[PDB]
Amino acid sequence: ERDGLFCARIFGPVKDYECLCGKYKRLKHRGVICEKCGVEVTQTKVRRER
Amino acid sequence: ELQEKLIAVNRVSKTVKGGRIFSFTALTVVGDGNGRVGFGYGKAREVPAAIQKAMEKARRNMINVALNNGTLQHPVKGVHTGSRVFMQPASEGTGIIAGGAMRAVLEVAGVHNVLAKAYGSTNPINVVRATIDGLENMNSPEMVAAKRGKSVEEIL
Amino acid sequence: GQKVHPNGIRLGIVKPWNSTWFANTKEFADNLDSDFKVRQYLTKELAKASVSRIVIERPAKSIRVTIHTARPGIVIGKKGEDVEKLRKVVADIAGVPAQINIAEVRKPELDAKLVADSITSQLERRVMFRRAMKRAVQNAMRLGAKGIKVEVSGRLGGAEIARTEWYREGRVPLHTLRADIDYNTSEAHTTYGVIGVKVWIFKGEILG
Amino acid sequence: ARYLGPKLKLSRREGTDLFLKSGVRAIDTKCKIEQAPGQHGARKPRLSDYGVQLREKQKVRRIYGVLERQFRNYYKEAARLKGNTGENLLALLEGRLDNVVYRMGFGATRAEARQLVSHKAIMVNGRVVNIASYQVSPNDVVSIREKAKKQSRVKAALELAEQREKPTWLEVDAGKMEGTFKRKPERSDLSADINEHLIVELYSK
Amino acid sequence: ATVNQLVRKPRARKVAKSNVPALEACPQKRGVCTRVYTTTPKKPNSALRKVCRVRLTNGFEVTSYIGGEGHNLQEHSVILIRGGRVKPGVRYHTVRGALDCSGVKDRKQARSKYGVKRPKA
RNA sequence: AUGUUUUUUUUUUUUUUUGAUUUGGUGAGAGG
RNA sequence: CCCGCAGAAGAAGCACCGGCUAACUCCGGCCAGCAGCCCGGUAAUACGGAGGGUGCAAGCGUUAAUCGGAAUUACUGGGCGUAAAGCGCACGCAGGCGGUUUGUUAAGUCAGAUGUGAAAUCCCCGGGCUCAACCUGGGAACUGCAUCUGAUACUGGCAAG
Numbered sequence: 001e002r003d004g005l006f007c008a009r010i011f012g013p014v015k016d017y018e019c020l021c022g023k024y025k026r027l028k029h030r031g032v033i034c035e036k037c038g039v040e041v042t043q044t045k046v047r048r049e050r
Numbered sequence: 051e052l053q054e055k056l057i058a059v060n061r062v063s064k065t066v067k068g069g070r071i072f073s074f075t076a077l078t079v080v081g082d083g084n085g086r087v088g089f090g091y092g093k094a095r096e097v098p099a100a101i102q103k104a105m106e107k108a109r110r111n112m113i114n115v116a117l118n119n120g121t122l123q124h125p126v127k128g129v130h131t132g133s134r135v136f137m138q139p140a141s142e143g144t145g146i147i148a149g150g151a152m153r154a155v156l157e158v159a160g161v162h163n164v165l166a167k168a169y170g171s172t173n174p175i176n177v178v179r180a181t182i183d184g185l186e187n188m189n190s191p192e193m194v195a196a197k198r199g200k201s202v203e204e205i206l
Numbered sequence: 207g208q209k210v211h212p213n214g215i216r217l218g219i220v221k222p223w224n225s226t227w228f229a230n231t232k233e234f235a236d237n238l239d240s241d242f243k244v245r246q247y248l249t250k251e252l253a254k255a256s257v258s259r260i261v262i263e264r265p266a267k268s269i270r271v272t273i274h275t276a277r278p279g280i281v282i283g284k285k286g287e288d289v290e291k292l293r294k295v296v297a298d299i300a301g302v303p304a305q306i307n308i309a310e311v312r313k314p315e316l317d318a319k320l321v322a323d324s325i326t327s328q329l330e331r332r333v334m335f336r337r338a339m340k341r342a343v344q345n346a347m348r349l350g351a352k353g354i355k356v357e358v359s360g361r362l363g364g365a366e367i368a369r370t371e372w373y374r375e376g377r378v379p380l381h382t383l384r385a386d387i388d389y390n391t392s393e394a395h396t397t398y399g400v401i402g403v404k405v406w407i408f409k410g411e412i413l414g
Numbered sequence: 415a416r417y418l419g420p421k422l423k424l425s426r427r428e429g430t431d432l433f434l435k436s437g438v439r440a441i442d443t444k445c446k447i448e449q450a451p452g453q454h455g456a457r458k459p460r461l462s463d464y465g466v467q468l469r470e471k472q473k474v475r476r477i478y479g480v481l482e483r484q485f486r487n488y489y490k491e492a493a494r495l496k497g498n499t500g501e502n503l504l505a506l507l508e509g510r511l512d513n514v515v516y517r518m519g520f521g522a523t524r525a526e527a528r529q530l531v532s533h534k535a536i537m538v539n540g541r542v543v544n545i546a547s548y549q550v551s552p553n554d555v556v557s558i559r560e561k562a563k564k565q566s567r568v569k570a571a572l573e574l575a576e577q578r579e580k581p582t583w584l585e586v587d588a589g590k591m592e593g594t595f596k597r598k599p600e601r602s603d604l605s606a607d608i609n610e611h612l613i614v615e616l617y618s619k
Numbered sequence: 620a621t622v623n624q625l626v627r628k629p630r631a632r633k634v635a636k637s638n639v640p641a642l643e644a645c646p647q648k649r650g651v652c653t654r655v656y657t658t659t660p661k662k663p664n665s666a667l668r669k670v671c672r673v674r675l676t677n678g679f680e681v682t683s684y685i686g687g688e689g690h691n692l693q694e695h696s697v698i699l700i701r702g703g704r705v706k707p708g709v710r711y712h713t714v715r716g717a718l719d720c721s722g723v724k725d726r727k728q729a730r731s732k733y734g735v736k737r738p739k740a
Numbered sequence: 741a742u743g744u745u746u747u748u749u750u751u752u753u754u755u756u757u758u759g760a761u762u763u764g765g766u767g768a769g770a771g772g
Numbered sequence: 773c774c775c776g777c778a779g780a781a782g783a784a785g786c787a788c789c790g791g792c793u794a795a796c797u798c799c800g801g802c803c804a805g806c807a808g809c810c811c812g813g814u815a816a817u818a819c820g821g822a823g824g825g826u827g828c829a830a831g832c833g834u835u836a837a838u839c840g841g842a843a844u845u846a847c848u849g850g851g852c853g854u855a856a857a858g859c860g861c862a863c864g865c866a867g868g869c870g871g872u873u874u875g876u877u878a879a880g881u882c883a884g885a886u887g888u889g890a891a892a893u894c895c896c897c898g899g900g901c902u903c904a905a906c907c908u909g910g911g912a913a914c915u916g917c918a919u920c921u922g923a924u925a926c927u928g929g930c931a932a933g
């Protein structure tokens with residue numbers, strides 16, 4: 001849910017180094033946050049500490 | 051981390067008693083997006099194998115290149131056989147202005163901004179070699195300072 | 207037509223026969239015909255089941271078939287339902303009491319015929335022949351073949367000019383009689399024409 | 415002077431989502447976004463050096479809805495201007511009035527925004543500007559006029575935008591329906607997938 | 620090469636002659652068909668290529684290719700030629716759909732290039 | 741003694757590596 | 773220029789899709805035809821039609837013409853044993869170039885200034901037509917020429933070695 005309890009921008013992307021919605025499907029720009037996704041771009045265990 | 055570009059693949063023949071035996075040559079070039087570059091020239095009866103061989107060759111015998119930011123440090127000429135090559139450092143935004151085999155080598159090397167003409171022959175294999183030579187010879191400011199027994203501010 | 211058939215040259219030594227019976231000049235031709243029939247039937251039936259070798263053996267006015275197949279489960283079906291069905295038809299074909307046995311083929315990648323069949327199938331479903339060939343070779347090698355060769359021929363990639371291509375790996379001695387050379391063949395009836403697949407699989411040399 | 419055909423086809427061709435439809439419904443549901451258009455979609459051989467560049471150029475052009483001559487002109491302008499060329503070009507593209515409007519959220523799509531601009535809905539510094547290519551400057555307030563303020567489409571667009579990430583380089587008011595173009599955007603603020611450099615190279619043939 | 624030498628006698632620019640001289644730097648020229656005929660092309664090709672010897676407005680007697688399938692041209696037919704050589708001695712094409720030369724019948728693609736009007740339906 | 745003495749398209753693209761085999765509370769019963 | 777009226781209404785084509793070159797399939801016999809350079813003889817992604825695509829778009833193609841690519845007349849910036857290219861060999865006027873030191877001159881050279889180098893055009897920062905083209909203010913530039921005042925390493929002149 002964007003943006004509910006289990007958000008994207010507030011915490012992180014479900015998938016590792018992926019915008020959950022759609023951009024960055026390789027290992028080049030880890031961090032960019034487009035307006036269509038409102039998502040960070042890090043590890044799968046990054047949400048466990050945030 | 052390494053990026054690898056197959057520049058060209060060319061079919062080459064050997065005449066024998068029966069007829070013509072065909073084979074394939076693959077010219078590749080690999081780089082880490084920083085100073086390190088290496089071209090490889092592989093050969094085999096089938097294309098993919100040849101390409102693989104080329105890649106393997108490339109991966110060993112790499113070479114370091116001193117890069118001032120995204121571009122070169124000064125205008126540099128490089129020659130090899132027919133292909134004589136000029137390449138000139140250029141302002142951020144301009145991109146790799148260079149043709150063919152030459153472009154590929156530059157891209158892997160992690161030069162982002164160049165003005166580069168290939169005079170003479172444009173035989174991919176030779177031209178890439180020439181480019182490599184040019185890159186190799188190109189000295190940095192620090193290096194020059196070291197050579198000359200001076201500081202970097204003395205040279206500017 | 208240079209080469210001798212690798213199975214055929216070795217029947218006296220390292221390879222055995224498929225049809226294994228005695229008959230006088232009177233009944234021999236008939237027997238042969240029967241064998242041809244039954245085998246044909248079996249091939250037709252158990253196409254989807256991976257079947258390598260049908261071994262016919264008839265003692266005392268009763269036919270014993272032995273089907274070598276990679277997956278018995280699909281040939282047997284439910285325990286003694288499909289086999290039984292097969293049997294009566296076999297009997298009918300022959301005109302004698304039938305008995306079907308089913309040998310389970312360990313390592314279908316090392317059985318040559320099976321491999322050939324697989325390749326043919328692949329060809330039919332429009333894969334890159336070369337990639338299929340590679341797969342065939344590689345797999346066999348992995349499995350522990352001392353060597354393998356495969357050859358495919360004619361209208362490769364639907365090309366107008368037909369040609370043959372072949373991949374060898376390991377050692378495949380054909381002149382050596384004592385070498386266990388499992389040879390077999392198949393034919394891909396593609397849209398552009400037939401594509402014949404040969405495959406030689408060298409298990410190893412027999413010492414006696 | 416405009417592309418009037420199927421929008422999702424273009425997106426498909428490109429590979430990416432170009433944002434040529436509002437974003438109520440996801441692009442994967444509306445079309446086979448992975449598969450390229452036409453009879454020979456499933457086949458996808460690696461493109462040439464020229465070809466990739468061309469594709470990139472198209473993508474950018476498609477995104478903003480700018481035909482070729484205009485694009486060329488823009489590129490030229492960028493080149494003329496000081497600083498990084500690709501970046502400059504991008505900035506110029508952004509600066510377009512319709513684009514700005516879209517960003518603000520008065521149009522669901524860029525097309526919608528453009529239409530609005532055309533139909534004398536939008537004002538820039540209290541003066542009705544009708545040109546979609548109008549380059550909006552820093553500190554230039556841009557608003558919906560009182561006639562077009564009642565439209566249901568505008569509010570929908572705004573809502574859509576609100577779901578979408580807000581650009582840092584603008585400041586928009588949903589109630590007042592007026593946004594201030596505070597500054598020309600930095601390259602970091604824009605999307606990272608656009609290889610401006612390729613575009614630059616293409617024109618530097 | 621030597622600077623002195625150059626000074627003495629400067630570098631000669633290679634003067635490239637025009638491969639369509641009967642136009643005389645005109646995009647097209649009007650001409651009358653002196654005769655119309657078929658000709659066999661050189662190796663390795665095989666055809667009966669339709670061609671017309673044209674007396675031009677400016678006085679030259681040239682031979683012009685006739686593109687497309689079929690043509691209405693006769694002797695004493697006023698045609699426009701455009702330049703372009705068919706790959707012996709033909710350096711010009713008749714513009715189909717100009718003056719007396721008709722557009723090609725039943726053609727739907729590259730229509731412009733053979734004078735053909737847009738099909739209505 | 742001698743050979744430009746029957747030419748016609750019987751045509752140039754790989755795999756690529758880069759990532760893993762996936763199951764939370766409640767209550768009841770048995771063994772030691 | 774502004775306001776009001778009605779209703780998606782009146783408003784999209786051209787070239788191309790063998791490689792170069794972005795875009796592929798099916799159906800019609802070295803013919804008909806294509807072609808800028810390098811197909812067609814019965815499975816043509818190359819001819820013609822279709823469907824599908826690509827590129828431009830109120831234009832799109834073709835032709836002509838110029839520069840470019842062409843470092844393919846190479847001042848910047850090429851060459852000449854075998855690829856085109858060293859006079860058959862010499863002497864030698866004009867011409868080009870000229871070892872080393874000091875002095876002097878100040879022609880070349882360099883520096884600064886003055887005059888001029890029309891306006892427009894080009895380029896920079898601005899302003900005005902809703903934007904743009906277009907118009908427009910100021911600058912820069914116009915690489916030069918002339919004159920005056922210096923500098924004297926280098927080249928030249930003159931004088932001595």
Ligand SMILES: [Zn+2]
Nearest residue numbers: 019023034037
């Ligand atoms: Zn994203």
